């Protein structure tokens, strides 16, 4: 993980978007590519459609998801089974 002294990582644009959403009080999904962005307390409640390489997959943020990153909840590979 990232160093504690450096703080958490979130993409600036993403953060801005989140802030805007908060200000509004809207619940329309924000399509995002920043899979590397950490989830924040203020992001709780928002749906945020994270890119998985191919498509944006909706992620309703929860109290448990905070320390994690957005890419953790948007699996890229699509394996069903060998038979």
């Amino acid at each position: 993980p990232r160093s504690l002294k450096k703080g958490p990582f979130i993409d600036l644009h993403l953060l801005k978007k989140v802030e805007k959403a908060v200000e509004s009080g809207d619940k329309k999904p924000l399509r995002t590519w920043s899979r590397r962005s950490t989830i924040f307390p203020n992001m709780i409640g928002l749906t945020i459609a994270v890119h998985n390489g191919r498509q944006h997959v909706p992620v309703f943020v929860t109290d448990e998801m905070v320390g994690h990153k957005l890419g953790e909840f948007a699996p890229t590979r699509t394996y069903r089974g060998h038979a």
Binding site: H68, E72, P75, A83
Partner: protein, 116 residues
Amino acid sequence: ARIAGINIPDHKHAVIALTSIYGVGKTRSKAILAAAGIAEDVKISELSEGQIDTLRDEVAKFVVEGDLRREISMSIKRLMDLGCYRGLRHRRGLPVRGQRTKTNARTRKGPRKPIK
């Protein structure tokens, strides 16, 4: 020779003996011993009752045996609930830390299952 919630081997040395507790390895055992004021080399046999009590008390400071197990369970369960990558991996039975399964995930995947 009953510490935390288990029995402990009497013939073995203290440091080693303690390691029989789920949640204490070698370093932790050593620490416990230090706290007690008991030598590492002595056995669990030929110990005083007071000493044993002290040891028990020391052990009680850490999260061990049942509590530890519970804690361990909780995290995994939480992960599963989340459905984060790690959680998904756990539910699959596939390596979580980012190992290149290819032809070597036999600890998670278990023994080989021929195609049928």
